Design a protein around this ligand. Structure first.
Ligand SMILES: [Mg+2]
Ligand SMILES: [Mg+2]
Ligand SMILES: [Mg+2]
Ligand SMILES: [Mg+2]
Ligand SMILES: [Mg+2]
Ligand SMILES: [Mg+2]
Ligand SMILES: [Mg+2]
Ligand SMILES: [Mg+2]
Ligand SMILES: [Mg+2]
Ligand SMILES: [Mg+2]
Ligand SMILES: [Mg+2]
Ligand SMILES: [Mg+2]
Ligand SMILES: [Mg+2]
Ligand SMILES: [Mg+2]
Ligand SMILES: [Mg+2]
Ligand SMILES: [Mg+2]
Ligand SMILES: [Mg+2]
Ligand SMILES: [Mg+2]
Ligand SMILES: [Mg+2]
Ligand SMILES: [Mg+2]
Ligand SMILES: [Mg+2]
Ligand SMILES: [Mg+2]
Ligand SMILES: [Mg+2]
Ligand SMILES: [Mg+2]
Ligand SMILES: [Mg+2]
Ligand SMILES: [Mg+2]
Ligand SMILES: [Mg+2]
Ligand SMILES: [Mg+2]
Ligand SMILES: [Mg+2]
Ligand SMILES: [Mg+2]
Ligand SMILES: [Mg+2]
Ligand SMILES: [Mg+2]
Ligand SMILES: [Mg+2]
Ligand SMILES: [Mg+2]
Ligand SMILES: [Mg+2]
Ligand SMILES: [Mg+2]
Ligand SMILES: [Mg+2]
Ligand SMILES: [Mg+2]
Ligand SMILES: [Mg+2]
Ligand SMILES: [Mg+2]
Ligand SMILES: [Mg+2]
Ligand SMILES: [Mg+2]
Ligand SMILES: [Mg+2]
Ligand SMILES: [Mg+2]
Lengths: 51, 142, 118, 144, 99
RNA sequence: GCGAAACAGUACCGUGAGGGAAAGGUGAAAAGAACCCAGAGAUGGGAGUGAAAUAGAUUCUGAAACCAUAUGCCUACAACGUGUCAGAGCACAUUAAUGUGUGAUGGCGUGCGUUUUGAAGUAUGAGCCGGCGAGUUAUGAUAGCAAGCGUUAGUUAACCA
RNA sequence: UUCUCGCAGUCAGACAGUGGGGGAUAAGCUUCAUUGUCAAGAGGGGAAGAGCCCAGAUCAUUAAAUAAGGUCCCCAAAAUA
RNA sequence: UUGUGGUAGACGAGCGUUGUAUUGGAGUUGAAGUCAAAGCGUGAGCAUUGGUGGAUCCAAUACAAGUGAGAAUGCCGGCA
């Protein structure tokens, strides 16, 4: 392979990155996958492990 | 053949100047001067000076007859404003906007002057379409 | 690497504005109102394609019904006679015949009237 | 794609007609009057070109209302004030103003529209045998 | 003089030297196609379809219709889908009516 | 980007500690418009310099909202989320395309986000336009996919060059 | 629709039929079991209606046959006895 | 052949912006920007011509992100 044409093995480098803020067309807009108005949808997070 | 005169940052507001400009559009030279010299408005002794200067540079600079001039278009475009703070009651404040107008008067000798402007617009459109056709011919040639 | 937005927002906004050309005042000037009107206009266009398919059928039925009542026959029996005689013609073309070709439309009604079914 | 149908381009084949409401029922006369005015019975019906013929009605006071409707059915008109609701019985309408009754009955059978105004205009209703409309040479047809 | 043909699913009344638009037929421009299904010809109308009655047509172009933008939108439901359609047609002109 | 590309911790606010802005680009060279006309003058219109003066000190490019002018079409018996599908007439001619601009008239038609069982909403948020504005980084764990090395395997951290 | 692993959202429901409890055989009431729809679903009927009836929208067609419902006019379509 | 309504949500495939690395190319005979037009796409989007503009920009394959604005009684500027 040259430096002007360099390629990875298929299904090794690029995978679908889940962008959480860019529009509803990606299915990950607005809410961004947290749900709706509850504790898990705030900036704090997912409480404590084992709770 | 349009002669014109301009005045930037005239203190009169465009709203109160358009009322006077609409009294002179389409009027003959002498009649426009006569109408504007006896109208009790502030924006009458400023449009008069602009009109007189426009007549002077039409019959001196551009070489026009002088007995065929009519006011083609007299308008008062919006000029730059000035912001001041008016002190209101109970500690509040508002913004006073001093308005200015850019006055421009234009007179012509030909009573068919609109046709030439439309003609120039048509010529520009035709040149665009002509460019497109020559480009299409070049694309097919290759 | 500070990517700065320019010519990206304006191009996609001017597309919506171009679509909403010919609207009343701000409905063609501002991008927001223009976008709403285009979406609403698309919904209207979608619904009226379906409604056009039904409304033009109704108009053909009305014209055909009228053309028959002048001769003493009704729409409800004309279609039945058409089916029994195996004749398969759109009400559109039949109405076009009754408006453009009175003699040939009258020929079709004469055959369906009395001739033996099949 | 397909071939478009023919639609009249503001073509006026309108003609004048005469009918005699000697003993015609109000509703039975009004339905056919509306059909004639709209031109729905015409072979070519373009529903934006008012392709319907004019009509003159004679002997309006001679129309009849079946049953006890001459004394039990009321016609109502309300002004924009309070209490301005005027009521007239079937008999009173048949005597005082019968032309208005037939006019209102025909108007009620028309679609809410901007062309229905012109359609109701083309109805000339008279209460007597005489009419100032003999200069139009209107053809005579019965029960329409 | 006139005929009722069935191209695709629509029925067209055609005269001599009449150009009408039908659905795509997969035929090159310039060929001579022979439409088969004919309902009415002159004065003899066949009940299902006339037999041996053929409509000879010449294909003029294979263009596409005007673009249609289908924008499906569910109000206040986070659903705005957009799609476009350019339906292909073919234009053909009647040359001769086979007896 | 430092609050500060300019004379910024300045102007300004507060008794004080303290708080704290905005603002860059003429032209290669000022050659920065002598002179004439109108005007009281600024200024404007010519002239002149310049490749360009619609580069003129208001000084690179100049978007939209906004305000005016005009060719063409429509509009003063008309119930309107302002559009859509049909549709005459009028006026033109194009990224040549069953063309474009307006739309007498007919059918249908209660916005966008938010949050709710349920919003045309007599619930809420936005006056309009433009810019900015919200899933990242460091260190670890698990899982999917892929590559290197392999059955006494695999792989280095700090550090040195 | 069973088993194993990765990532979730959901824990305010509503109405209609049917069997009941609380209420007074009142509630567009409240609490259950079950069949459906809406939520997250447009179209046609109901004049207008989230939940009732007929059904499930990939796009275009000015093609044809039908479901609930309907055929004097508005508004497509009927006649006999 | 069976299919293609859809919110929360799961999965897959792509567009666009800025820069870097390799290749090639355009540009004072006029690049970017910017306006207009009766073009091309299934969608993000992409061209052609003409006006203005006066010096950089484009195509392909990869890589890294301050990478996508209509709403936050959002901030700033302008204008109703
Ligand atoms: Mg989703
Ligand atoms: Mg999630
Ligand atoms: Mg909740
Ligand atoms: Mg929220
Ligand atoms: Mg939750
Ligand atoms: Mg004070
Ligand atoms: Mg103000
Ligand atoms: Mg932005
Ligand atoms: Mg001080
Ligand atoms: Mg100058
Ligand atoms: Mg300025
Ligand atoms: Mg400038
Ligand atoms: Mg009028
Ligand atoms: Mg009236
Ligand atoms: Mg009304
Ligand atoms: Mg209306
Ligand atoms: Mg309309
Ligand atoms: Mg409405
Ligand atoms: Mg949003
Ligand atoms: Mg609430
Ligand atoms: Mg509530
Ligand atoms: Mg309201
Ligand atoms: Mg409130
Ligand atoms: Mg609230
Ligand atoms: Mg508000
Ligand atoms: Mg904004
Ligand atoms: Mg791993
Ligand atoms: Mg429950
Ligand atoms: Mg409960
Ligand atoms: Mg119950
Ligand atoms: Mg009970
Ligand atoms: Mg109960
Ligand atoms: Mg309840
Ligand atoms: Mg919900
Ligand atoms: Mg429904
Ligand atoms: Mg309904
Ligand atoms: Mg389906
Ligand atoms: Mg049938
Ligand atoms: Mg039935
Ligand atoms: Mg009917
Ligand atoms: Mg789907
Ligand atoms: Mg790049
Ligand atoms: Mg350019
Ligand atoms: Mg950002």
């Amino acid at each position: 392979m040259e430096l002007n044409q360099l390629k990875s093995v298929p299904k090794a480098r690029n995978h679908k990155t889940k962008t959480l803020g860019r529009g509803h067309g990606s299915g990950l807009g607005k809410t961004s996958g947290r749900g709706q108005k509850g504790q898990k949808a705030r900036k704090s997070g997912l409480t404590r492990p084992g709770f | 053949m349009i002669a014109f005169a301009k005045q930037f940052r005239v203190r009169i507001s465009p709203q109160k100047a358009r009322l006077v400009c609409q009294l002179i559009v389409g009027k003959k030279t002498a009649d426009a001067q006569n109408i504007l010299s006896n109208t009790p408005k502030k924006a009458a002794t400023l449009i008069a000076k602009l009109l007189n200067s426009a007549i002077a540079n039409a019959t001196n600079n551009h070489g026009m007859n002088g007995d065929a001039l009519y006011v083609f278009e007299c308008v008062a475009n919006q000029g730059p404003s000035m912001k001041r703070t008016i002190p209101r009651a109970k500690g509040s404040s508002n913004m006073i906007t001093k308005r200015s107008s850019n006055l421009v008067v234009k007179l012509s000798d030909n009573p068919n002057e609109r046709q030439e402007l439309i003609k120039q617009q048509k010529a520009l459109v035709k040149k665009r379409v002509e460019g497109q056709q020559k480009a299409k011919m070049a694309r097919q040639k290759a | 690497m500070r990517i700065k937005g320019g010519k990206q927002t304006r191009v996609r906004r001017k597309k919506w504005l171009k679509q909403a050309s010919g609207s009343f005042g701000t409905r063609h000037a501002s991008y927001k109102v223009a976008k709403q009107t285009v979406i609403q206009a698309a919904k209207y266009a979608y619904r009226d394609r379906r409604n056009k398919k039904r409304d033009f059928r109704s108009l053909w039925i009305l014209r055909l019904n009228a053309a028959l009542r002048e001769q003493g026959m009704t729409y409800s029996v004309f279609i039945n006679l058409l089916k029994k005689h195996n004749i398969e013609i759109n009400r559109k073309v039949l109405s076009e015949l009754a408006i453009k070709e009175p003699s040939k439309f009258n020929l079709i009604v004469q055959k369906v009237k009395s001739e033996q079914p099949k | 794609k397909t071939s478009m149908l023919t639609k009249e381009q503001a073509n006026k084949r309108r003609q004048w007609y005469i009918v005699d409401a000697a003993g015609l029922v109000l509703g039975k006369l009004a339905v056919k009057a509306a059909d004639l005015i709209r031109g729905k019975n015409k072979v070519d019906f373009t529903p934006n070109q008012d392709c319907g013929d004019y009509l003159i009605i004679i002997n309006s006071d001679q129309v009849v209302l079946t049953g006890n409707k001459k004394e039990n059915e009321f016609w109502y008109h309300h002004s924009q004030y309070i209490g301005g609701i005027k009521k007239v019985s079937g008999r009173d309408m048949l005597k005082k103003q019968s032309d208005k009754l037939v006019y209102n009955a025909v108007k009620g059978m028309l679609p809410d529209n901007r062309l229905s105004r012109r359609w109701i205009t083309k109805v000339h209703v008279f209460k007597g045998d005489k009419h100032n409309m003999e200069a139009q040479k209107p053809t005579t047809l019965n029960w329409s | 003089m006139h005929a009722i043909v069935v191209c695709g699913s629509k029925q067209y009344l055609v005269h001599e030297n009449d150009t009408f638009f039908v659905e795509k037929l997969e035929a090159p421009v310039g060929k001579e196609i022979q439409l088969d299904k004919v309902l009415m010809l002159d004065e003899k109308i066949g009940a299902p379809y006339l037999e041996k009655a053929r409509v000879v047509c010449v294909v003029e172009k294979h263009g596409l219709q005007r673009k249609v933008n289908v924008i499906k939108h569910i109000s206040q439901k986070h659903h705005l889908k957009k799609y476009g359609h350019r339906q292909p047609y073919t234009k053909l002109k009647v040359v001769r009516f086979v007896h």
